[PDB]
C-alpha cells in the first residue's frame, strides 16, 4: 500500500491509475504492459482471421480488417488482389503474438517487481513532469522512432516489393514505387485542400507516388523535429501558453488522438487507394455509382438510348450534369459524382462520363465489378444481415468500411470527451481548485455583483 | 389488551429490510403477479391464435422480440377472467386466448395503485410531505390512458400495446401511420417535459458537482460529505453567477429549483396522457385543413407536412394486412402506394 | 495599460453581465449570424430543391407554412457535401433555390455551439469552479453534430441533414427508421433509457427534496420564501429524504450522500445521450439496428412472424413512399 488505497493516495479505486502519476517505475510498467495488449491483439486477431479465411471469397465477405491491411502493403496478393500466398499473413500474426509476450514480461516486471520510481536509480530514465527539457527530450526520442516507422513504409514500397496499387494500368496489382512525389507544392498542397465535397483534404490522396512521397517528408520532418527537441528547451511563449503536468500532457495527446480518429473514419469511408476496394469492399459512394452503371448497362443492352432518356423528374434517368456541367450518373447518386475508381475512369473524358465510350466501350469486367459493388454496398444490420434495413435474413455481410468507420467514430468521440475531462482537470489542479471551492476564500464573494 | 387491528398495524409497520405496510397487502401480490405473468408469457406463451405471431423464448424469439400479446380482436374488451365464459377455467386455452394480457394489465394497474398508496403510507410514518406520491400520478396517468382508456375507445384490447420491446416499437410506428401522433400538440408537450426533465437532471447534477466546496483533502471528492452536516455542500452563489453569465438567467432559490424539477416531467407526462385519451376516439391532430385545400388545388405546393402524410399512407397500406389479421385484408400489388423504383 | 492588455482584461472579465471570453469572440458573431439568417429564412425564404430533382419544398411562413409545418430546408442533393457559401452562387436567387441558407445556418451554429461548450470550461476556470459542466453539455452538442454534420457526411449529402423545423424533424425521424431500423439499435435504446430515466430521476429528486423542506414559513406564504439565496445551511433534511426513499425501495437502493446522488443525476442522462448521439453517428455509416426479419421458421420452413416482422412491414411503407420521385434504380443505397 505505497499509495495503494484511497486514504493515502487521495484517489478512489475507480480512479486507481491516477495513483501512478508520480510513480515513474510502475507507470512505465503500465505503459509497457499496455503496449503488449495492443501487440497481442494484432497478433492473435491476425491468426484468428487467417484460420477463418477462405482465399477464394473476397476478404470483405469474411469480416477481415487486418488481412486487408497486410495485403495493401503488397504481401500475399497478386493481380486484382487475388491471394497468391497466405504465409506472409501467418508471419505477421505470429511475430506480433511472440513480441507481445516480451512486452508483457517487461510490463509485469516494472509494474510489480522493479523500482516504483526511477529517479533514485537513473537520472536518464527518471523524470519529473515539470522538467520541461526532459519532457521535450523524451518527446524527441519518440519522434525519431515514429520517423523511422514512416520510412519503413517507404522502404517496403521502393525496395522490398512495393505496394498493392488499385490504379495500376491494365488492372490492380502490386507495384514498386520508383518516382515518389517530393515536390513540396504537391505534398503540402494536400493539407490546404478544403475538406468539403470534390476536395476532401488529405483523404483525396489518389496515387501511391503521393502516398510514398508524403511519408519521406514525414519521416524526415519527425527525425529533424525529434533532434530539435533533444537539443532545445521550450521558448518563453510556449512556457506561458501551456500547462506543464502529466495530466495536461495526457490531455493534449487525447485531443490529438480524437482528431486522428475522426480523420481515420473519413479515410476508410471515402478513400479507395490506401483502402483498396478489392480488400475492403466498395465505398458507399462507389456502390451507389455502381448501381447506376449496372442499370445503364442493362437497359442500354435492351435498346435504351441512355443519353436521351428523360427520367420522371425531367432530369436524365441514367445521365445528367453536375452543377458545373460535367456529365454524371443520375438518380440519387447525383450526390456521389466526385467518386473516382479504376472500373469507372475508362468511361470518363474531359467533360465527364463520355457517351461514345458508354455506348461502345464498356467491357465485361466493368459490368462484373459494378454488379459486385452494387451488391456489396456498405449497408447492414448490427447482427450482420447484409442489405437495407427491410431486407430478409440470408446474406451474412457488414462491410469492413462500416465496422472500421463506426468503431473509430465512437473512439474519437469518447477521446474528445477525455480531452475535455483531463484538460479541464489539469487547468483546475494547476491553479489549485480541483477538489472544490475554499469556503473561506470563495472567489465569487470578492467580485462585484452583476446587478 | 389492545385490539387486533392495532396489533396487525404494528406488525405491518415494523422497520424491516422491505417495508410492508397496509399498502403492501395490495402492492406485493399485484406487482408480483404482473411481473411473473410477463416473465411466464414471454418465456413460454405464443401469440399464434390471437395475432398469428411467435412471442416466447420457447418458440425462438429473443429479449427484443418476445412479448405478452394482446387478445384477438373478436374478444372485444372482455376481462377475459380465467373462470370467465371464454376460457371456462381452462388455463391452457386462457393462455392461447390472450388471458395473460388482461392478467398483466389489471394486476399491474392495481399494483400501481398499491405503490402510490405505499408512497403516501411511508411519507406519513416518516413525517414528510407526500410530493413523491404526487409525482407518481404522471406514470399512473400514462399507464391508464395508454393500456386502458385507449383500447377501451377502440374496437378491442387487441389495439392496446402488447407487453414487449419490439411490440411497443410497433405501437409507436402504428401511432405515426394511423394517428399522425407526432403532429399532436399534447404529444409535443410530453416530449418537452421528458427532454426538459432529462436536461434538468443532467444540468443540476453537473452544476452541484462543479461548484462543490473543498471539504476534504481527497482528489476523489465524494467522501467529503456527511449526511447529518448542516451546511450546503456546493456554492449556490457561485452556481448562480456562472449560469447568469453563461445563459443569462440562473436559479437563485433552491426550493423553486427542486419544485421545478418535479413540475416539468410530471406535467409533460400528464399532457401526453390527455392526447392519448383523444386518440382513443380517433380524435387526432391528423391534418391542417388549410394545407390540404392548397395542396389539392395546387400540385406544385409541397411542405414537410404533406411529405409525412405520404409516409403515413405507406405505413398503413403496407402494415395493415399482417398487423390487423382479423380484417382479412388482401391488397393486390397494384393498389399498394409506392414511389418510383422502390 | 496598452490597448491589447485592456481588451484582454475586458474579454476575460468576470464582471461582465454575460461572460465574453476567447471562446466568446468566435461564439458571438457565429451565433448571431446563424440566428439572423434562420429568422429571416423561416419567415421569408422561397421553396428549396432539397432532393435535387427540381421539386422545391416550401419551408417559410410567407410561402404557406405555419409554425408546425415550417422549416429551413436542407441544401440540394445536387450539391451533396460541396461547400455552398453565398459567393459560390451566381445570385441570391440561385442560392435560395438550392438551399444555401441551411448550410450557412448549420455551419455557423455548430461552430458557435462548440464555442459555447468551451466558454463553459472558460468561465468555470475564471470563477475557481470545477471544470466539467462543459462535459455534460457535450451530450446534446454531440447529438446536434450527429444530425447536422456526421449523418450527412456518411450518406454523402447535406440534403440528408435534419431539417431546421418541427415537421421536418419528424420527416427525418421516419426516414431514418425506414433506412436504419433505429428503434432496434441498442444505442437508441440506451438513449431512451437515458431520457426516460433522466425525466424519472428529475421528478424523483425534485419530489424528494421538496418532501423534506424544513418548515420556515406560515400557511399563507409560499414555502420558497423559507430559502434565502446564499444562506449557508441546507434547506431540506437529506436524512429524512433518505429515510423515506430507503423505505420505499430498500435502504441500500437510496443515496444518503448528496455528492454521489448528484453525480448519478449528471451521469445517467449524459451517458445515455452520448450513446444516442453515437447511434446516429454510426448509423451514418450504415451499421444498423438489429434485423430479425424472418428469424423464426417452422419445421417445414414456413416463416413464423414475430413483432420484428410487423415493424418490418411498417418500415417498408416508409421506405417505398419516401422521396417518391427521386429513385430510378431498385435499391436505396444512400
Amino acid at each position: 500500500a505505497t499509495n495503494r488505497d484511497q486514504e493515502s493516495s487521495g484517489f478512489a479505486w475507480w480512479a486507481g491509475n491516477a495513483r501512478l502519476i508520480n510513480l515513474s517505475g510502475k507507470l512505465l510498467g503500465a505503459h509497457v504492459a499496455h503496449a503488449g495488449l495492443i501487440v497481442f491483439w494484432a497478433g492473435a486477431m491476425t491468426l484468428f482471421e487467417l484460420a477463418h479465411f477462405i482465399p477464394e471469397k473476397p476478404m470483405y465477405e469474411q469480416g477481415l480488417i487486418l488481412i486487408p491491411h497486410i495485403a495493401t502493403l503488397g504481401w500475399g496478393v497478386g493481380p486484382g488482389g487475388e491471394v497468391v500466398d497466405t504465409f506472409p499473413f501467418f508471419v505477421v500474426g505470429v511475430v506480433h503474438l511472440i513480441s507481445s509476450a516480451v512486452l508483457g514480461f517487461g510490463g509485469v516486471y516494472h509494474a510489480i517487481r522493479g523500482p516504483e520510481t526511477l529517479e533514485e536509480y537513473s537520472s536518464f530514465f527518471g523524470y519529473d513532469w515539470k522538467d520541461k527539457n526532459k519532457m521535450t527530450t523524451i518527446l524527441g526520442f519518440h519522434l525519431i522512432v515514429l520517423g523511422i516507422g514512416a520510412l519503413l513504409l517507404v522502404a517496403k514500397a521502393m525496395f522490398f516489393g512495393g505496394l498493392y496499387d488499385t490504379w495500376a494500368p491494365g488492372g490492380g496489382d502490386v507495384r514498386v514505387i520508383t518516382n515518389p512525389t517530393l515536390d513540396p507544392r504537391v505534398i503540402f498542397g494536400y493539407l490546404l485542400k478544403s475538406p468539403f465535397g470534390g476536395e476532401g483534404w488529405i483523404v483525396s490522396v489518389n496515387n501511391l507516388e503521393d502516398v510514398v512521397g508524403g511519408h519521406i517528408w514525414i519521416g524526415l520532418i519527425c527525425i529533424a523535429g525529434g533532434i530539435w527537441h533533444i537539443l532545445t528547451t521550450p521558448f518563453g511563449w510556449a512556457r506561458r501558453a501551456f500547462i506543464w503536468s502529466g495530466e495536461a500532457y495526457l490531455s493534449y495527446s487525447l485531443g490529438a488522438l480524437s482528431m486522428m480518429g475522426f480523420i481515420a473514419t473519413c479515410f476508410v469511408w471515402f478513400n479507395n487507394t490506401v483502402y483498396p476496394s478489392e480488400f475492403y469492399g466498395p465505398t458507399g459512394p462507389e456502390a451507389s455509382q455502381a448501381q447506376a452503371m449496372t442499370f445503364l448497362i442493362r437497359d442500354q443492352k435492351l435498346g435504351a438510348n441512355v443519353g436521351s432518356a428523360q427520367g420522371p423528374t425531367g432530369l436524365g434517368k441514367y445521365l445528367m450534369r453536375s452543377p458545373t456541367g460535367e456529365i454524371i450518373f443520375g438518380g440519387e447518386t447525383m450526390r456521389f459524382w466526385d467518386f473516382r475508381g479504376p472500373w469507372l475512369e475508362p468511361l470518363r473524358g474531359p467533360n465527364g462520363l463520355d457517351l461514345n465510350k458508354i455506348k461502345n466501350d464498356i467491357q465485361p469486367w466493368q459490368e462484373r465489378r459494378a454488379a459486385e459493388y452494387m451488391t456489396h454496398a456498405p449497408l447492414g444490420s448490427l447482427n450482420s444481415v447484409g442489405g437495407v434495413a427491410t431486407e430478409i435474413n440470408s446474406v451474412n455481410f457488414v462491410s469492413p468500411r462500416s465496422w472500421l468507420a463506426t468503431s473509430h467514430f465512437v473512439l474519437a468521440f469518447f477521446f474528445l470527451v477525455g480531452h475535455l475531462w483531463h484538460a479541464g482537470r489539469a487547468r483546475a489542479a494547476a491553479a489549485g481548485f480541483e477538489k472544490g471551492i475554499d469556503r473561506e476564500s470563495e472567489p465569487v464573494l470578492s467580485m462585484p455583483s452583476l446587478d | 389488551e389492545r385490539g387486533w387491528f392495532d396489533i396487525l398495524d404494528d406488525w405491518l409497520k415494523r422497520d424491516r429490510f422491505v417495508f410492508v405496510g397496509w399498502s403492501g397487502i395490495l402492492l406485493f401480490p399485484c406487482a408480483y403477479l404482473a411481473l411473473g405473468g410477463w416473465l411466464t408469457g414471454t418465456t413460454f406463451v405464443t401469440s399464434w391464435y390471437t395475432h398469428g405471431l411467435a412471442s416466447s423464448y420457447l418458440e425462438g424469439c429473443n429479449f427484443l422480440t418476445v412479448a405478452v400479446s394482446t387478445p384477438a380482436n373478436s374478444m372485444g374488451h372482455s376481462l377475459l377472467l380465467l373462470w370467465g365464459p371464454e376460457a371456462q377455467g381452462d388455463f391452457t386455452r386462457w393462455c392461447q386466448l390472450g388471458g395473460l394480457w388482461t392478467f398483466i394489465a389489471l394486476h399491474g394497474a392495481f399494483g400501481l395503485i398499491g405503490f402510490m398508496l405505499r408512497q403516501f403510507e411511508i411519507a406519513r410514518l416518516v413525517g414528510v410531505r407526500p410530493y413523491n406520491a404526487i409525482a407518481f400520478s404522471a406514470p399512473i396517468a400514462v399507464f391508464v390512458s395508454v393500456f386502458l382508456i385507449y383500447p377501451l375507445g377502440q374496437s378491442s384490447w387487441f389495439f392496446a400495446p402488447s407487453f414487449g420491446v419490439a411490440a411497443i416499437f410497433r405501437f409507436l410506428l402504428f401511432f405515426q401511420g394511423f394517428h399522425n401522433w407526432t403532429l399532436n400538440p399534447f404529444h409535443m408537450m410530453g416530449v418537452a417535459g421528458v427532454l426538459g426533465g432529462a436536461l434538468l437532471c443532467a444540468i443540476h447534477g453537473a452544476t452541484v458537482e462543479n461548484t462543490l466546496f473543498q471539504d476534504g483533502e481527497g482528489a476523489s471528492t465524494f467522501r467529503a460529505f456527511n449526511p447529518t452536516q448542516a451546511e450546503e455542500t456546493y456554492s449556490m452563489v457561485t452556481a448562480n453567477r456562472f449560469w447568469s453569465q453563461i445563459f443569462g438567467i440562473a436559479f437563485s432559490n433552491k426550493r423553486w429549483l427542486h419544485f421545478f424539477m418535479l413540475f416539468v416531467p410530471v406535467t409533460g407526462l400528464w399532457m401526453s396522457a390527455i392526447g392519448v385519451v383523444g386518440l382513443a376516439l380517433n380524435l387526432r391532430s391528423y391534418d391542417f385543413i388549410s394545407q390540404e385545400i392548397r395542396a389539392a388545388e395546387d400540385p406544385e405546393f409541397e411542405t414537410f407536412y404533406t411529405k409525412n402524410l405520404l409516409l403515413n399512407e405507406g405505413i398503413r397500406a403496407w402494415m395493415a394486412p399482417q398487423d390487423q389479421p382479423h380484417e382479412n385484408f388482401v391488397f393486390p400489388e397494384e393498389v399498394l402506394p409506392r414511389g418510383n423504383a422502390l | 495599460a496598452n490597448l491589447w492588455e485592456r481588451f484582454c482584461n475586458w474579454v476575460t472579465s468576470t464582471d461582465n453581465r454575460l461572460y465574453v471570453g476567447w471562446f466568446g469572440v468566435i461564439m458571438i458573431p457565429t451565433l448571431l449570424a446563424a440566428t439572423i439568417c434562420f429568422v429571416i429564412a423561416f419567415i421569408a425564404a422561397p421553396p428549396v430543391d432539397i432532393d435535387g430533382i427540381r421539386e422545391p419544398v416550401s419551408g417559410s411562413l410567407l410561402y404557406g407554412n405555419n409554425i408546425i409545418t415550417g422549416a429551413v430546408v436542407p441544401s440540394s442533393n445536387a450539391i451533396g457535401l460541396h461547400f455552398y457559401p453565398i459567393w459560390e452562387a451566381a445570385s441570391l436567387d440561385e442560392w435560395l433555390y438550392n438551399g444555401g441558407p441551411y448550410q450557412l445556418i448549420i455551419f455557423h451554429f455548430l461552430l458557435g455551439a462548440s464555442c459555447y461548450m468551451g466558454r463553459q470550461w472558460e468561465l468555470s476556470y475564471r470563477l475557481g469552479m470545477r471544470p466539467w459542466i462543459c462535459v455534460a453539455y457535450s451530450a446534446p452538442l454531440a447529438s446536434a453534430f450527429a444530425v447536422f454534420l456526421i449523418y450527412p457526411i456518411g450518406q454523402g449529402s447535406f440534403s440528408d441533414g435534419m431539417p431546421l423545423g418541427i415537421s421536418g424533424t419528424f420527416n427525418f425521424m421516419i426516414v431514418f427508421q425506414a433506412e436504419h431500423n433505429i428503434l432496434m439499435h441498442p444505442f437508441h435504446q440506451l438513449g431512451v433509457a437515458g431520457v426516460f430515466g433522466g425525466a424519472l430521476f428529475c421528478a424523483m429528486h425534485g419530489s424528494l427534496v421538496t418532501s423534506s423542506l424544513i418548515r420556515e414559513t406560515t400557511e399563507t406564504e409560499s414555502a420558497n420564501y423559507g430559502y434565502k439565496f446564499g444562506q449557508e445551511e441546507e434547506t431540506y433534511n437529506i436524512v429524512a429524504a433518505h429515510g423515506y426513499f430507503g423505505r420505499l425501495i430498500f435502504q441500500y437502493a437510496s443515496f444518503n450522500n448528496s455528492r454521489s446522488l448528484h453525480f448519478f443525476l449528471a451521469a445517467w442522462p449524459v451517458v445515455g445521450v452520448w450513446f444516442t448521439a453515437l447511434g446516429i453517428s454510426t448509423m451514418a455509416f450504415n451499421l444498423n439496428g438489429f434485423n430479425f426479419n424472418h428469424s423464426v421458421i417452422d419445421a417445414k420452413g414456413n416463416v413464423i412472424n414475430t413483432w420484428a416482422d410487423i415493424i418490418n412491414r411498417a418500415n417498408l411503407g416508409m421506405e417505398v413512399m419516401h422521396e417518391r420521385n427521386a429513385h430510378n434504380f431498385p435499391l436505396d443505397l444512400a
Binding site: 464573494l445 455583483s449 452583476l450 | 452563489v237 448562480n240 443569462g248 438567467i249 | 411562413l61 439565496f229
Partner: peptide
C-alpha cells in the same frame, strides 16, 4: 394575418428574453 400572428408572438418571446435577462430581479446574497 397568420404570418403576422406567428411573428408577433415570436417577437414578444424575444423581448421577454431581453427583460428577463437585463431587467431581472437581482439575486441578493444578504
Amino acid at each position: 394575418m397568420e404570418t403576422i400572428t406567428y411573428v408577433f408572438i415570436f417577437a414578444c418571446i424575444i423581448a421577454l428574453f431581453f427583460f428577463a435577462i437585463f431587467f431581472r430581479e437581482p439575486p441578493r446574497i444578504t
